[PDB]
Amino acid sequence: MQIKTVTFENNRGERLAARLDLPVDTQPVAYALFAHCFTCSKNLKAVTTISRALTTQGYAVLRFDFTGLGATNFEDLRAACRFLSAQYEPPALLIGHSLGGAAVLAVAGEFPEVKAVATIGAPCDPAHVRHLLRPALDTTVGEAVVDLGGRPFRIKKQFLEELERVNLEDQVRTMRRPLLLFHSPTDQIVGIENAACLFQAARHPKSFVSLDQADHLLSNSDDAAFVGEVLGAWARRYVG
């Protein structure tokens, strides 16, 4: 594995940063976009453990920090996908954790080259997102403060507005791509009922893997390794 810092712009010319994790394979089996909220934790051990499991299997992984902790919206995720399409290969796998999971599910259908989608702890609807969010104080307008049980962060109000308008369950039903949902039954932030909701909305192929006693932010790195290894093995059926 080699890790690189990358930079790219969105359609407003704003500069975004990400980390690109490359495998030993000169040609990766696939490039994955991984939109996540693990930056809410005390460290990045969860996301680097997942990413390392994927690079071990030959994937390249673009880690996109959805929290902005180092304000996000759908266009920033699209910008990351365009960056991969231009400078690498269009991503064949989308991965989303927490709010990032809701985001990748809502945009996956926009990208024909995406062959598989996987999420971790994703909420299924606006009511369960509202549980996590409150309006931020205006000065910079139109943002919200998110609480996932760790470091809080800001996002654009446009995110929930757009998510509510496109309807996540409709998007999942019409995605026409294989889906893998990970969720902990003991998740205190986004309840396990959200995974059942998403699974019922989806069409086959659809899959679900239980994270047993894991927490929302995967603070046990054994759980993060598990997610990465299973995800990589599963997606290989579809990406090549």
Numbering used by the authors: 1 to 70, 82 to 150, 153 to 253
Article sentences:
Carboxylesterases (EC 3.1.1.1.) and lipases (EC 3.1.1.3) catalyse the hydrolysis and synthesis of ester bonds across a large variety of substrates. Esterases generally show promiscuous activity with a specificity for either the alcohol or acid moiety. They are members of the α/β hydrolase superfamily with most using a catalytic triad of serine, aspartic acid and histidine in the active site, where the serine residue (found in the sequence motif GxSxG), is responsible for the nucleophilic attack on the substrate. We have described seven members of a new family of serine esterases all containing a C-terminal OsmC-like domain taken from extremophilic bacteria from a wide range of ecological niches. An enzyme from the thermophilic bacterium, Rhodothermus marinus showed particularly high activity, even at low temperatures and was subjected to further kinetic characterisation and crystal structure determination.
